[PDB]
């Protein structure tokens, strides 16, 4: 009967602080390790850390020194804080729970929905349309609609590109 849901899917820039709050509905906060996990296409599934109701945390050694988990028992919440986020932390963040006791055979239960968090890496630019089909070179906010289509490309500079084969281009923020 215990269900978990986190905050809405936000988006952050580089060198900032990430913040997600999970809310438990039903059940108590005692005798349960409230964990945090993330899932990325580059590295697969990964564990971040858990907090017990007395405040005893246990972070992952890879992310130690830039992670912080706090518990708020009275309002039935627990939060995750990530410090100095880079462009390689674009992942779907889950929340789970573990029974108190031995962790040799323990598996994560009561998973969350999963809120996608992306990192912009400080990029904002208007469209650039080149003729060939048609090719769009650089645009940040994904507003494009090609009318007279291959999906976008995660370039290393933080900008997106697609192309279409067989025109009019659209850009909602720049009004292009």
């Amino acid at each position: 009967q215990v269900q978990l849901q986190e905050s809405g899917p936000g988006v952050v820039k580089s060198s900032e602080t990430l913040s997600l709050t999970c809310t438990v509905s039903g059940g108590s906060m005692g005798g349960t390790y409230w964990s945090w996990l993330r899932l990325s296409p580059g590295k697969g599934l990964e564990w971040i850390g858990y907090i017990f109701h007395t405040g005893e945390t246990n972070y992952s050694p890879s992310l130690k020194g830039r992670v912080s988990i706090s518990v708020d028992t009275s309002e039935d919440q627990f939060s995750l804080r990530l410090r100095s986020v880079t462009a390689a932390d674009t992942a779907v963040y889950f929340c789970a729970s573990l029974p108190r006791g031995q962790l040799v055979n323990a598996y994560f239960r009561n998973w969350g929905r999963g809120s996608l968090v992306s990192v912009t890496a400080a990029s904002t630019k208007g469209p650039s349309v080149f003729p060939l089909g048609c090719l769009v070179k650089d645009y940040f906010p994904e507003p494009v609609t090609v009318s007279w289509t291959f999906p976008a490309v995660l370039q290393s500079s933080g900008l997106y590109s697609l192309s279409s084969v067989v025109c009019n281009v659209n850009h909602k923020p720049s009004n292009t």
Binding site: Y33, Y50, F52, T54, E56, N58, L98, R100, G101, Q102, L103, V104
Partner: peptide, 9 residues
Amino acid sequence: NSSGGDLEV
């Protein structure tokens, strides 16, 4: 040796 999470286990 033990495999608990908290310091009491």
